[model samples]
Target: HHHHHHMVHITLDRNTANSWLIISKDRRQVRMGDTHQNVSDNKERFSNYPMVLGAQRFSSGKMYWEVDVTQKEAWDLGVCRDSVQRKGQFSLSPENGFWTIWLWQDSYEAGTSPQTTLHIQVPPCQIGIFVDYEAGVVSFYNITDHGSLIYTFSECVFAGPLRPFFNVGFNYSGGNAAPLKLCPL
Candidate 1:
């Protein structure tokens, strides 16, 4: 529904990452539980979820970011309000401040209130997310298919600044271990 627009650079914020997650020194790549680096706990860190947040915070304007998910089998990507929960038992949904699309095994779904199942014709290895703050919309793109439309979340209820959200999912059996990469322009 939109155009092939520019994407901004995004990096992981160490402070917001879960203890079991490993964020690269370059801050562009992140994975979970390979030797499970025991990062010290903090108020901002995720306690039970293997999730991470991008460093740049946005309260206005439209911007985009692309992620490389080539070999990975499981992952969750999107944006969330600044103060969304980082603790346990928190699910990814617009109601919980997350607007995302995810892959579970070979199936894809949108993070709506009831969660929308997606049947993508061509699975995207590289996905792009474009958000319009004032318009309250977040659009997901299939970068592997000429920037094809995957889905969009309209009329989002953003109450605070927003940040990119990532979940290096533990597979159904914790086998999807590859890191999710923040790709360049």
Candidate 2:
């Protein structure tokens, strides 16, 4: 992987997290739970989803972070505009200020207007996401495949700070319970 962009740290924001989640003490790992803990409702939180946003914001420049999604059957990983709608049901497309990729069952798809399907040779144990704010590109890599490129979202219109975001796939049975851990580098 001839990557030159600086690696970034991602701390899952508790304030924006869904109450039905268990975050590690360091805020780098997250897993879903059955019992929803009582948390004050806020505009920044996801009311109908089990997701969380990173504490750090990327306004410009090239940076990246790696997430361990090992053996997950359902999950969503990507960046979203800070002002994106956080409540109710919304399309996870770039037009809605969300640029993401998701895995449902055995399928992988990019969160585009007409979501693109991806047939990956290797199920990624770890995913590396790199974004070039000025270039309007967000890239996903398969760390297990030696940093091989998986998908890219180009020509995006980023108007504000974008935060690293994730959706813990707790609804899926079995492997879905595996925690999404952010790599510290």
For this target, which candidate reaches the highest TM-score against the unseen true structure? 2
- Which residue runs does candidate 1 get wrong by more than 4 Å? 1-5, 171-174
The Cα local distance difference test for each model comes to 0.87, 0.88
For all the candidates, what are their Cα RMSDs to the real structure? 1.6, 1.2
Write model 2 residue lDDT over 98-158, tens digit each, in one string: 9899998698999998999986998999999989999999999999998989998998898
User: What tens-digit string does per-residue lDDT give for candidate 1 at 111-133?
Assistant: 88788998699989899899999
Clashes of 1: 0
Q: How many clashes in candidate 2? A: 0
Model 1: colliding residue pairs:
none
**What lDDT does candidate 1 reach at residue 64?**
88
User: If scored against the real structure, what TM-score would every candidate get?
Assistant: 0.94, 0.95
TM-score of 1: 0.94
